[PDB]
From Swiss-Prot, chains A, D, E, F:
GO process annotations (BP): protein secretion
GO-annotated cellular components: cell outer membrane
Name of the coding gene: prgK
Principal subcellular localisation of the protein: membrane
Topology relative to the membrane: Lipid-anchor
Localization in the cell: Cell outer membrane
Cited function: Required for invasion of epithelial cells. Could be involved in protein secretion.
Keywords: Cell outer membrane, Lipoprotein, Membrane, Palmitate, Protein transport, Signal, Transmembrane, Transmembrane helix, Transport, Virulence
Family, as annotated: Belongs to the YscJ lipoprotein family.
Protein name, as recorded: Lipoprotein PrgK
Tree of life domain: Bacteria
UniProtKB/Swiss-Prot annotation, chains B, H:
Subcellular location: Cell membrane
Task performed by this protein: Required for invasion of epithelial cells.
Its membrane topology: Single-pass membrane protein
Name of the protein this chain belongs to: Protein PrgH
This protein's UniProt keywords: Cell membrane, Membrane, Transmembrane, Transmembrane helix, Virulence
Lineage: superkingdom: Bacteria
CC per GO annotation: plasma membrane
Predominant subcellular localization, coarse grouping: membrane
From Swiss-Prot, chain C:
Membrane-crossing segments per the record: 11-31, 35-55
GO biological process: bacterial-type flagellum assembly; bacterial-type flagellum-dependent swarming motility; protein secretion
Described purpose of this protein according to its UniProt entry: Involved in a secretory pathway responsible for the surface presentation of determinants needed for the entry of Salmonella species into mammalian cells.
Keywords, in A-Z order: Cell membrane, Membrane, Transmembrane, Transmembrane helix, Virulence
Subcellular localization, as worded in the UniProt entry: Cell membrane
Family note: Belongs to the FliP/MopC/SpaP family.
One Gene Ontology cellular component: plasma membrane
Top-level taxon of origin: Bacteria
First-listed, main subcellular location of the protein, grouped into a coarse class: membrane
Name of the protein in question: Surface presentation of antigens protein SpaP
Length: 184, 222, 73, 184, 184, 184, 221, 222
């Protein structure tokens, strides 16, 4: 019944429980109204659960986007702060369209940023992309490089097939059975 | 409170073996299930003593014992497909032990593993070890450079490989290391920037000459 | 030449900015008193002129303008 | 019963506990409401615990990032502060994307900051990256140095495979057993 | 029973106790609420405890950084101040990233500061780095010096291997036994 | 018990007691309440304590730094008043970093300051460093001078090994036994 | 209670050996278990005397005695794979010892190790010690240079190595120091930057490097 | 209370020796345990008289007596592994002593150390003291320069050394002075830049330094 985390978020507590339940220790999610949730664990499992908090760097930070460093409510917007807020929404829309393919569970896209070509007379350069994906298992994940590369190659003005980098992998084994209470 | 009941509900992913030294061994399969079974024996909800073993780490443990009492021995792997009767893959062409000092090795390997019953020693050929590594590397259409030397062989895969050749090479090395092990043949996947994927030439007065494999590479303007 | 008139006109506005703060902070202290009708220009120009030479202005922008072009000093 | 630290944070107390439990000494996380947490050890285990507080530099300082030295609430914002606030969000998003690979537990990415090169008339120099990673053990960590270089080679303008240095390692042995109370 | 230091804070008191306890004298930390901690020793140990206070320069002063001499709250900020607040946040992030290696307990990185290259038309000089580290004992610390050089080489624009100096050392012997109360 | 000093500091009284106890005369750290600390010696030890106060120049002045007379609170700051504040924080951070080496009890670092080169027609000169150190005894302190010059060499732009002078020395004898009251 | 009950829950990572001078010995196998078992005996929840031994700092202790009472002795390592009968790996081609004084050295090592019962001394060749170190350094495809001299051999690894080869080197040197130790063969990995990255040069007998269209560099042989 | 119980819990680091002059010597082995034992005897919670001895301190103290009563002696080090029978390493190819005055020296050294029972004097050879010093300096791949003169050699290690060549050159010297002493062979590590930094010079028996394209300097023959 020794607590180890409190004041957490809704999506943060579901990331702490799904990490502890993978390693044969069970946790209790307790709501507290306005002060968030809280996770308690048993006394023989407190030594292991502190070690997996330290190892996995839990609780998770909220995910960062490039459009948050340049807020739209500012009175003066640079050409750099408009080109970065443009690419930071194309980068999110592409990873939201990658998840509607046949077999993708999660994805992450990275667009190369160009800033210092607009203010001076230097010409812009070729734009580079990079991708990550998690596929459902039982699928031939070697033949699905060309479908993601073909979809990404025609969403910008000038990219090559050797300027796109796709690194993808299959998902882990499923955790379906309960942890179990520690008897004494 | 039996040991097979203190594990999970599905009683087919673990296997409890009785020992000779009065200790029960739990033979898991991968790294994720070894900590699932070590949490049970760590929280202490079991009366007597027990140990958890694994295929990957009993072969790392037995090589620390083996390279102190039997040095200069050529072998490949120990397979635990039947854990009460393992198979020890010895090299035929690189050692000259007799039958009696192979049975002494088979009895001293048995006394190291209290869960086994009889270790079976089979002599594997040494040509098919480097033969299946070349014939499986030509099938994926990967560029390679075989380097032979005394007591081992190495395959080097350099160049600015693309995303399919990285996936097929990494997917093949992990399926070859499980069968043979990295004691004899070793792979050397490395990425650097040259469009000629490893090979190099020099040009004079007759055409091109295939240069020797070396460490310096020409960076590619292209 | 068109890139130098452009690069000079946005430096002169930054230079313009402190002075507007001065003649907006000296013209508002008169209206706090009973001085709604007096002209603030004849009070603004000495308080703007004795501050710029006392803070060494004309040797601060003559240095900062030549540092753009050459390795001065 | 002797107090070691007080007025800590929730994320600061689980690191002191995760360090003291590795060296066979117990600790007690006592909440004080508004004043924060506090950690007490036994009197036979007070001489070793002060030594590990001094050696391991506990309590941990909060992690510093480059976008904190140039806050967005400023009245003026030079292009030096807009490029530094941009690169400091790219190296946070790239290290958040490295933790979603197969087997990676934590990572850290550094970008070479070149802020005056694009301002001056000299052409901007090449960009250098560097990454660290902690892998789940049992992994062949010699082959995984090429997937991280393939992933973050095409996420910028013009990088070479010689300007990327990845230094990675496997995690420590797991601490699962309880420390044990001092008997007197 | 005699007091030698009062009014100390938490981090100062935990480093005065850890210094005296390795020289076979026993100290007592006494909280006083608002006025801070206080440290009292016994009567035979006062002549030696004053000698180690004088020799070791205790209490420890707070550690200084370059980013404190140029705060971000000023209305105007020179480019010498923006570059000094940038390099001092890079050399803090690099030493917070060196502690995540295998065996490092503490580290300290220094960067050469260049401030006068941007004000006039002089070309910038090369950039120099220097690191310190403290390792766990039992480690072969001669081959650990190539990974910090490879990690530090391409975290900047262009450095060589002759401008990086790493001086590292194993940690001191562990203090685990109690000091001992003087009989009288 | 004739009085000697009053109105001192917590650190100013710990140096007076540490000086008088070296020369076989006792002292009393009598607290005065809101005034401060006061040192009273015995009547036969009054002549010797007055002579050692005059010789050792006690009470100690507060130690001066260069960034104390160019404060960052003024609305305008010269580049002369910004380079002296940058170098005065570098020569303190290098002093804090030298004390974490193996065997050093205390150290002091001086850097050559630059004044006239901001406005004169000459380029700025090279940088000169100077360091002192006090080592724990039993150290072969002829070999330690190559680990301090190597660390101090590439922490700046370009210094030579001829422009660094290290003068270090082992610490004095230990003072552990009590002085002893006068037999009257 | 007993010493094996005052340690952790899992009674496998510690071995308790009975001494000969009425003391007890705990044999850890790394530094984390050595500091785990030293906190028990340091806090004082045990009546009689006990010590914590190791693999490294026990090989470090009986080399201090062995560089005072037996200098000029060529040996490699003292193996503790089973702690009741350790193996002493002595050299064959560098010793001048007969049958008798090997037994006297065995009896003087048994007095140095009170937890042991006998010490088995074997003799290993110096050709296989420097042959396995060159064949393993050739199998990883690393650039190396061998320097032979009397009573030692050194391998120098220089160049602009990438991030794969400095991990392949560390996994081999760490796997070799565990078996043979650093008494005979020493590895020297130092990495330097390359000059001929973008330069044009002539190699061979008459070698030079063109640092510019008007600048020749003739390096010393 | 006894002295071995007035120290810490671990009664393994200290060793109490009963002196012959009605005293009691405690023998630490470093300077941190020497201050750990000197604090107990200095605060005065022990009735009788006792002293704290060491290895480096007692080997520095006995050379002050030997530098007055036996000048021009060629010795190396006093070894204290067993603190009741210390070993005195004397030189062989440099002394003019017969078998009688060596017993006289071995009795006057016994009278200086009351904790010892007998002092053993062994004659170490003089050539192997510099043979081990050169062979250990060549395995670390260090550049050096040996200077031979009578009654001592000198190895100079200079130039611009990197960080691996400083850390390798310090762990060897501290491991060699610990077992041989700094009486005979002296190491001179000196980290300095190259002489004549950016100047072109014309070395050998008629030398000059080009201070400029049109400036000749004529010092000592470079």
């Amino acid at each position: 019944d020794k607590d180890l985390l409190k004041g957490l978020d809704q999506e943060q507590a579901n990331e702490v429980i799904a990490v502890l339940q993978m390693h044969n220790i069970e946790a209790n999610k307790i709501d507290s109204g306005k002060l968030g949730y809280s996770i308690t664990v048993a006394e023989p499992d407190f030594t292991a659960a502190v070690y997996w908090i330290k190892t996995y760097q839990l609780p998770p930070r909220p995910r960062v986007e490039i459009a948050q460093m340049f807020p739209a409510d500012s009175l003066v917007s640079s050409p750099r702060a408009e080109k970065a807020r443009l690419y930071s929404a194309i980068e999110q829309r592409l990873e939201q369209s990658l998840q509607t393919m046949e077999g993708v569970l999660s994805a992450r896209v990275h667009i190369s940023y160009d800033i210092d070509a607009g203010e001076n007379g230097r010409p812009p350069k070729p734009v580079h992309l990079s991708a990550l994906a998690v596929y459902e298992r039982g699928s031939p994940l070697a033949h699905q490089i060309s479908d993601i590369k073909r979809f990404l190659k025609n969403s910008f003005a000038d990219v090559d097939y050797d300027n796109i980098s796709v690194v993808l992998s299959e998902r882990s084994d499923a955790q379906l059975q309960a942890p179990g209470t520690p008897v004494k | 409170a039996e040991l097979d009941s203190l594990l999970g509900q599905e009683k087919e992913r673990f296997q409890v073996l009785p020992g000779r030294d009065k200790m029960l061994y739990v033979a898991a399969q991968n790294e994720r299930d070894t900590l699932w079974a070590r949490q049970v024996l760590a929280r202490g909800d079991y009366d007597k003593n027990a140990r958890v073993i694994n295929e990957n780490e009993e072969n790392k443990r037995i090589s620390i014992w083996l390279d102190t009492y039997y040095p200069q021995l050529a072998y490949y792997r120990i397979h635990f497909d039947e854990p009460r009767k393992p198979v020890f893959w010895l090299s035929r062409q690189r050692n000259t032990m007799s039958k009696k000092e192979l049975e002494v090795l088979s009895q001293k390997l048995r006394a190291l593993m209290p869960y086994a019953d009889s270790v079976n020693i089979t002599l594997m050929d040494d040509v098919t070890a480097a033969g299946q590594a070349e014939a499986g590397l030509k099938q994926q259409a990967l560029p390679y450079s075989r380097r032979n030397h005394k007591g081992g062989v190495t395959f080097v895969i350099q160049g600015a490989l693309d995303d399919v050749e990285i996936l097929r090479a990494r997917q093949f090395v992990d399926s070859y290391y499980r069968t043979w092990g990295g004691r004899y043949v070793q792979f050397a996947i490395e990425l650097k920037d040259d469009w000629l994927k490893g090979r190099s030439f020099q040009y004079g007065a007759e055409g091109y000459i295939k240069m020797s494999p070396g460490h310096w590479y020409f960076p590619s303007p292209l | 030449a068109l890139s130098e008139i452009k690069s000079a006109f946005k430096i002169g506005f930054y230079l313009y900015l402190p002075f507007v703060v001065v003649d907006l902070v000296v013209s508002s202290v008169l209206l706090a008193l009973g001085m709604m009708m007096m002209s603030p220009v004849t009070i603004s120009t000495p308080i703007k002129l004795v501050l710029f030479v006392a803070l060494d202005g004309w040797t601060l922008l003559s240095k900062g303008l030549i540092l753009q072009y050459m390795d001065i000093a």
